[PDB]
């Protein structure tokens, strides 16, 4: 009865699985931003191109 | 398609809830992605999917 007061008391006892969902998050999140980068284009966008 | 004052794109256009400031014209999600955009002629916002 106590483990369940000790996970509610505290907050970084999920570290594993907050970090694993974290990580998988802002790795998609750089995949998608990393679009507007132009790579020496002139412009990022296919239509402006 | 649309084409919001220069702002190319492709999607549905559909009623948002969400009001945008006076001066705001486009709008962005984390994912620096346009989620809405505001009419430049009813000044009404339509999220873009
Ligand atoms: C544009 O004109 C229409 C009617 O002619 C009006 O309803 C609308 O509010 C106007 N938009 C702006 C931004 O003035």
Same mark, same amino acid.
Request: proline letters at 2%; charged letters at 15%.
């Given at each position: 009865?106590?483990?369940? *007061?000790?996970? $509610?008391?505290?907050?970084?006892?999920?570290?594993? &699985?907050? *970090?694993?969902?974290?990580?998988?998050?802002?790795?998609?999140?750089?995949?998608?931003?990393?679009? $507007?980068?132009?790579?020496?284009?002139? $412009? $990022?966008? &296919?239509? *402006?191109? | #398609?649309?084409?919001? #004052? =220069?702002?190319?794109?492709? =999607?549905?256009?559909?009623?948002?809830?969400?009001?945008?400031?006076?001066?705001?014209?486009? =709008?962005?999600? !984390?994912?620096?992605?346009?989620?809405?955009?505001?009419?430049?002629?009813?000044?009404? !916002?339509?999220? !873009?999917?």
């Amino acid at each position: 009865g106590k483990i369940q *007061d000790s996970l $509610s008391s505290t907050a970084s006892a999920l570290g594993k &699985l907050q *970090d694993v969902v974290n990580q998988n998050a802002q790795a998609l999140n750089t995949l998608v931003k990393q679009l $507007s980068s132009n790579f020496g284009a002139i $412009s $990022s966008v &296919l239509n *402006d191109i | #398609n649309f084409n919001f #004052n =220069g702002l190319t794109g492709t =999607g549905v256009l559909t009623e948002s809830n969400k009001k945008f400031l006076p001066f705001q014209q486009f =709008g962005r999600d !984390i994912a620096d992605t346009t989620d809405a955009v505001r009419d430049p002629q009813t000044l009404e !916002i339509l999220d !873009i999917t």
